[PDB]
Amino acid sequence: RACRFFC
């Protein structure tokens, strides 16, 4: 997974 949105 490439994040929810902001990491």
* DSSP 8-class letter at 6: -
Question: Which technique was used to obtain these atomic coordinates?
Answer: NMR
Length of the chain counted residue by residue = 7
Tokens at 5, concatenated: 């949105």
Residue type, 6: F
Q: Which two tokens stand for residue 6?
A: 């902001």
Q: What is the CA radius of gyration of the chain?
A: 5
